[PDB]
């Protein structure tokens, strides 16, 4: 699903813009890292954005 | 299920009349009825002994009445052969 299991961050659409200001569609990916964490008190490899790991509240196992 | 659900009506034709000389009785039966159910039902209803049941499916005949096309019902015909030592139906 390429979605952060904590924050819900996911791919989002928008534009490239050339110098000539031509718009073409692109996506912004979340900076997701597959990592072992407790998911209902069960160690599991899930996707977590770097941003959600930045604090250190989301504790790896 | 009731035996009388199984047998619907007798077939009265020249063919059916000829088979009755050979002690063979033709019935229309419920289209879901297997030939065991027909054997069981004929013995239950008429108090006869059945040698064999042969069974066939007829498709519906396409039909016309004026401007309206349709289809007769599907039929399941059973030919019930009684044993030689048996009462007639």
């Amino acid at each position: 699903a390429r979605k952060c299991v904590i924050t819900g961050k996911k791919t989002t659409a928008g534009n490239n813009r050339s110098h000539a200001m031509n718009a073409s569609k692109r996506t912004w990916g979340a900076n997701l890292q597959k990592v072992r964490i407790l998911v209902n008190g069960k160690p599991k490899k899930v996707y977590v954005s770097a941003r959600a790991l930045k604090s250190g509240k989301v504790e790896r196992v | 299920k009731d035996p009388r659900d199984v047998l619907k009506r007798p077939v009265i034709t020249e063919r059916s009349a000829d088979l009755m000389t050979e002690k063979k009785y033709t019935f229309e039966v419920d289209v879901r009825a297997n030939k065991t159910e027909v054997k069981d039902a004929v013995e239950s209803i008429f108090g006869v002994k059945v040698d064999k049941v042969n069974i066939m499916n007829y498709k519906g005949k396409s039909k016309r009445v004026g401007r309206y096309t349709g289809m007769t019902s599907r039929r399941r015909k059973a030919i019930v052969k009684l044993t030689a030592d048996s009462k007639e139906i």
């Binding site: - | 009731d2 009388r4 047998l7 619907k8 009506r9 007798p10 009265i12 209803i45």
Partner: protein, 65 residues
């Protein structure tokens, strides 16, 4: 009529149902052979059976509650 049928026991109804289904069977055979004069009887017997099965089922619903 149903008023009369409700006076009977379930067992007595189920016997009458069995008895009518035999009658209906015989009528259907008479109709096939072309012997049956009173064709209106077929409809009466079918509706009698229906009436009885309705009463039976009312009692099942009355009990299982």
């Amino acid at each position: 009529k149903a008023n009369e049928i409700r006076d009977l026991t379930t067992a007595e109804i189920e016997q009458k149902v069995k008895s009518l289904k035999e009658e209906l069977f015989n009528l259907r055979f008479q109709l096939a052979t072309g012997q049956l004069e009173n064709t209106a009887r077929i409809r009466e017997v079918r509706k009698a059976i229906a009436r009885m099965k309705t009463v039976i089922r009312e009692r099942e619903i009355a009990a299982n509650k």
